[PDB]
Write a protein that binds this DNA or RNA. Structure first.
Length: 571
DNA sequence: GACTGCTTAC
DNA sequence: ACACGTAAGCAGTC
C-alpha cells in the first residue's frame, strides 16, 4: 500500500534570503498523522524515507524549493531513475506535474517519493475548494510580509493556518480518490471516465491515431474562443445593458453537435460533398470583404500582414492563408464576401452525434442530484473532457539545473513525441462553440457590445425577441440571463467594467434587475490585472494610462522562488 | 510571427 | 512511460 500526503510550505520574501520558515504534511487517509515544522532539512529528511506520493497545491512554487535542496544534497536530474537522482515532468510552458525522487532499488522494485501538483487535480485556490466542497476553512491568512529570521518560531495562529490548508486539500483529494478519480489530473480523470464508458477497444477504433504530419495539419484549424468588442463602443462609457451566457458551452456542443470520428480521408483541391464523410477541414488561400450588417469572424495569426488579435473588416489587399473546419467556413461564407478563393487541400471525416451522450448525462445526473463536493467533482468531470482530445503530441519537457548563480534554471530536453489523441474532435467542438456565440451575437447585431467565448453583452435591459426562444437559466446549451448593468465601459478585448444591478435574497447580494435592485456592485474584468490592483480601478481612471506598481512577479533566486513587486499598465 | 516568464478571461 | 487548452496582455533581457 502506497501512502498519500497533503503538503505545504510557507517561505520568506527577501531576494537575498529565500528559505522555508514552516512546512506541513498530513496523511490524506489519516488526518491525525501530520506534522508542522520549521526546517526544510527536516522536511526533506522525511521526504527521503516516507517512500510515498506527496501533493502540494501549486507544485511550480514549493517545487523550486525542493529542487534547490536536492541539488545541494547529492541529487541530480535523471530521466533514467538511477539512485540519488530525481526525474521531473515539467512542460514547455513551465507547468509542473511531478518530481520523482529515487533513492535506490530493493530487487526490481523502486524506492522513491513522488511529488505531484494537487492544483492539477483541483484547479482552484484552496480557499474556494473549502467553500465549494463544504470543508472547514479559516478566514484571513498568514501575515506574508513580516520579519522572520532563521529559527523564527511558528506561532499558534500560523500553525492553525498551515494545518488548515493541508487538511482542506487532504479532505478534498480523499473525496476525489474515493469517487474513483485517482489519476494525476482532472483532465486525465475525464478522458479515462469517457474511455471507460465507450470502452478502450472502441475508443481506439473510433478515435484512431493520426500521424504527426496529419495531426499538425488538423491543428492549423484548431482555435479557441471568440473574443470581440464592437468598436463603436470602444473606450466609451455606456448606460444600461445585459449579459447572457451559454449553459456549459462545450459540453453542450458535445451533447448534440455533428462531431467527427474515424480514419480521415485526405483530398486535394476543394472538398466534394459526401454523406458518409460530411465534416471536413479545408486549406484555402483567399481575399475577402465583410458584408454590411455583419460581425467579423476571420482572425489571422502567424502572418506578417496582421495583427493576430483583430477580427478583420477586410483582407486589405493581401492573400489570406487559412485552415478551416466546415463550420468555420460556412459561417465565414455567410458573414463575408470571399473571393479569388484557392482551394488547396483538406481532410474529410465521418461524423455522428451523441458520442458523448452517456458520459454527459451520467455526470449531469450526478451534478443535479448531489450537493457540495461531489457536485463540484461532477462539474470537474464534465468541463475537463474536451480539452484533451486535441492534446499536443509534442511533449518536449523542461529539465531543471542550478545556474552558476545559485538559482534554478531550465533547459529544453530532447524532442519527445506522444501519440495524438484525436485533434479533429477538438477542432470541431470549439468551432461549434464559436458558431453558437457568433450567430447569437449576429441575431442581436443592432444591440451587441461584446463577446468572450460563451458570452454576449447587449445594450438595453429587455430580452431580445430573436433570442427569447433559446433563453433559459438552466437547460444545457441555452442562454442564461446572468446579469444586467446600470453602466459599463469596454476598453478593448478582455478589458471592461460593469456596475451590476444586485439585490438581497436571504440577506445575500445576488444579481437582480432594474425594477428590483437594492444595491450596485462594481466589477472589473481585465486580463493581466491581479485582484489587488482591481480595487484601485474606478470608473473615472479605467483607461489607457492606468498604472499601479502592485503586481507580484515570481522570480527564481538561490534557494527558491520569491514574489517581487512589479507594475501593471494599460497600454 | 517567431525572446522569456508571467498574469487573467473563459 | 505519466502530461487539457487558446486567447489577449505587460515588462523586462539580450
Amino acid at each position: 500500500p502506497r501512502k498519500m500526503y497533503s503538503c505545504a510550505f510557507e517561505t520568506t520574501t527577501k531576494v537575498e534570503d529565500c528559505r522555508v520558515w514552516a512546512y506541513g504534511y498530513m496523511n490524506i487517509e489519516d488526518h491525525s498523522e501530520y506534522k508542522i515544522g520549521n526546517s526544510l532539512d527536516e522536511f526533506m529528511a522525511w521526504v527521503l524515507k516516507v517512500q510515498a506520493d506527496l501533493y502540494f497545491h501549486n507544485l511550480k512554487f514549493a517545487g523550486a524549493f525542493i529542487i534547490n535542496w536536492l541539488e545541494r544534497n547529492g541529487f541530480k536530474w535523471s530521466a533514467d531513475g538511477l539512485p540519488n537522482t530525481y526525474n521531473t515532468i515539467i512542460s514547455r510552458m513551465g507547468q509542473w506535474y511531478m518530481i520523482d525522487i529515487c533513492l535506490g532499488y530493493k530487487g526490481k522494485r523502486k524506492i522513491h517519493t513522488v511529488i505531484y501538483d494537487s492544483l492539477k487535480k483541483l484547479p482552484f485556490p484552496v480557499k474556494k475548494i473549502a467553500k465549494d466542497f463544504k470543508l472547514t476553512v479559516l478566514k484571513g491568512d498568514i501575515d506574508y510580509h513580516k520579519e522572520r529570521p532563521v529559527g523564527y518560531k511558528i506561532t499558534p495562529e500560523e500553525y492553525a493556518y498551515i494545518k488548515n490548508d493541508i487538511q482542506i486539500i487532504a479532505e478534498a483529494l480523499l473525496i476525489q480518490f474515493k469517487q474513483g478519480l485517482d489519476r494525476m489530473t482532472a483532465g486525465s480523470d475525464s478522458l479515462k471516465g469517457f474511455k471507460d464508458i465507450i470502452t478502450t477497444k472502441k475508443f481506439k477504433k473510433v478515435f484512431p491515431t493520426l500521424s504527426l504530419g496529419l495531426d499538425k495539419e488538423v491543428r492549423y484549424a484548431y482555435r479557441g474562443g471568440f473574443t470581440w468588442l464592437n468598436d463603436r463602443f470602444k473606450e466609451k462609457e455606456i448606460g444600461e445593458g445585459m449579459v447572457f451566457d451559454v449553459n456549459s458551452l462545450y459540453p453542450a456542443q458535445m451533447y448534440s453537435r455533428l462531431l467527427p470520428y474515424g480514419e480521415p480521408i485526405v483530398f486535394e483541391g476543394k472538398y466534394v460533398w459526401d454523406e458518409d464523410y460530411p465534416l471536413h477541414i479545408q486549406h484555402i488561400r483567399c481575399e475577402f470583404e465583410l458584408k454590411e450588417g455583419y460581425i467579423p469572424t476571420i482572425q489571422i495569426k502567424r502572418s506578417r500582414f496582421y495583427k493576430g488579435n483583430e477580427y478583420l473588416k477586410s483582407s486589405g489587399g493581401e492573400i489570406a492563408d487559412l485552415w478551416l473546419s466546415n463550420v468555420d467556413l460556412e459561417l465565414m461564407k455567410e458573414h463575408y464576401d470571399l473571393y479569388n478563393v484557392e482551394y488547396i487541400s483538406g481532410l474529410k471525416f465521418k461524423a455522428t452525434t451523441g458520442l458523448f451522450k452517456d458520459f454527459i448525462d451520467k455526470w449531469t445526473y450526478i451534478k443535479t442530484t448531489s450537493e457540495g463536493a461531489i457536485k463540484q467533482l461532477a462539474k470537474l468531470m464534465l468541463n475537463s473532457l474536451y480539452g484533451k482530445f486535441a492534446s499536443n503530441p509534442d511533449v518536449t519537457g523542461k529539465v531543471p539545473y542550478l545556474k552558476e548563480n545559485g538559482a534554478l534554471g531550465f533547459r529544453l530536453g530532447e524532442e519527445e513525441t506522444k501519440d495524438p489523441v484525436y485533434t479533429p474532435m477538438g477542432v470541431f467542438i470549439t468551432a461549434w462553440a464559436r458558431y453558437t456565440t457568433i450567430t447569437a451575437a449576429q441575431a442581436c447585431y443592432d444591440r451587441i457590445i461584446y463577446c468572450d467565448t460563451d458570452s454576449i453583452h447587449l445594450t438595453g435591459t429587455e430580452i431580445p425577441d430573436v433570442i427569447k426562444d433559446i433563453v433559459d437559466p438552466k437547460k444545457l446549451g441555452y442562454w442564461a440571463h446572468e446579469s444586467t448593468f446600470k453602466r459599463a465601459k469596454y476598453l478593448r478585448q478582455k478589458t471592461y467594467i460593469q456596475d451590476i444591478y444586485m439585490k438581497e435574497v436571504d440577506g445575500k447580494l445576488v444579481e437582480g434587475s432594474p425594477d428590483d435592485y437594492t444595491d450596485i456592485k462594481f466589477s472589473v474584468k481585465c486580463a493581466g490585472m491581479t485582484d489587488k490592483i482591481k480595487k484601485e480601478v474606478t470608473f473615472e481612471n479605467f483607461k489607457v494610462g492606468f498604472s499601479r506598481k502592485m503586481k507580484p512577479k515570481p522570480v527564481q533566486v538561490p534557494g527558491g522562488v520569491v514574489l517581487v513587486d512589479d507594475t501593471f499598465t494599460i497600454k
